[PDB]
Design a protein around this ligand. Structure first.
Ligand SMILES: CCCCCCCC/C=C\CCCCCCCC(=O)OC[C@H](O)CO
Ligand SMILES: CCCCCCCC/C=C\CCCCCCCC(=O)OC[C@H](O)CO
Ligand SMILES: [Hg+2]
Ligand SMILES: [Hg+2]
Length: 270
């Protein structure tokens, strides 16, 4: 059946691109256009399968995410860093504040930038930001591990997450670029952007799910569930592959890939 085959295709697109710095939103508007699923019911479908990819990080960093809110499961949490420091809830809070303040204050304006021409620009500009972060980052990272991050690095990454409010800019692209520019290693900057995505997008979709709750019906549960679960599986493969891939590879290929995706946005929509 078409409805669930499409739900499985959008699921694998969301699972791969949500946490890769390649703009899940950008890929979603392309494939959604080629599939024909572009109505108000699509925007509500694409926000619930985001919660599927959310749950992937949640599963992958289960013990870590709970330790930040005070729940330690009777075993020492595993240390990722060269110092005696530990990533705290304050690190997450600082990484959220700037984009939250700007997101709330400019909600109506942010929503008016969801054009395909804006997503195209955010794919190119966000790609250029990845290149600048790769070319400007220090030789020796100040925070090689996640637990080596400072309150200042966390806050500066948080300010960089405002760029993610630009539709098509890829929250992971913005936050990982800012991490590398603040002396955070690619691995820890990717880890921190995933962890930051959990409170950001769970509050983001909960926000979207409330304002768009009216569209949900009894018939959406089969489609909305097949995509949710698909985005969960694919993201768990994507995040685990990415974190091992980025240990050896740079972000240059992802930037160039974003330029190719920008070309597709123009071919498909203009
Ligand atoms: C759903 C739409 C499709 C999703 C688009 C995904 C984005 C990936 C694009 C560019 C990254 C290219 C880098 C990944 C390729 C690396 C493969 C590889 O083998 O490189 C490893 C290297 O050998 C180390 O030792
Ligand atoms: C708002 C979104 C902002 C996007 C920024 C756009 C373009 C930045 C690209 C400029 C990259 C050029 C920097 C290269 C460089 O100067 O490298 C210096 C040297 O490598 C170090 O010692
Ligand atoms: Hg350079
Ligand atoms: Hg900011």
């Amino acid at each position: 059946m078409h409805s669930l085959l499409i739900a499985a295709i959008l699921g694998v697109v969301e699972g791969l691109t949500e946490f890769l710095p390649v703009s899940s939103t950008g890929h979603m508007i392309i494939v959604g256009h080629l599939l024909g699923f572009e109505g108000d019911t699509a925007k509500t479908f694409e926000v619930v399968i985001q919660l599927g990819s959310i749950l992937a990080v949640v599963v992958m960093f289960w013990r870590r995410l709970f330790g930040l809110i005070g729940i330690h499961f009777g075993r020492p949490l595993q240390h990722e860093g060269e110092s005696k420091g530990r990533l705290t809830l304050i690190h997450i809070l600082l990484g959220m504040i700037p984009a939250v303040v700007l997101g709330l204050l400019f909600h109506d304006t942010i929503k008016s930038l969801f054009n395909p021409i804006n997503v195209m620009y955010a794919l190119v500009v966000g790609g250029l930001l990845l290149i600048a972060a790769e070319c400007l980052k220090p030789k020796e990272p100040r925070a090689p591990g996640l637990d080596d991050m400072t309150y200042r690095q966390a806050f500066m990454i948080g300010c960089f997450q405002c760029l993610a409010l630009w539709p098509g800019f890829s929250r992971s692209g913005a936050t990982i670029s800012g991490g590398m520019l603040m002396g955070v290693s690619r691995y820890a900057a990717s880890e921190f952007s995933f962890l930051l995505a959990v409170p950001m997008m769970m509050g983001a979709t909960a926000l979207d799910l409330y304002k768009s709750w009216g569209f949900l019906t009894s018939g959406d549960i089969p489609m909305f569930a097949v995509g949710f679960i698909t985005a969960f599986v694919v993201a768990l493969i994507a995040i685990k592959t990415f974190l091992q891939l980025i240990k050896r590879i740079s972000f240059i290929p992802f930037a160039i890939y974003r330029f190719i995706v920008a070309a597709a946005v123009y071919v498909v929509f203009f």
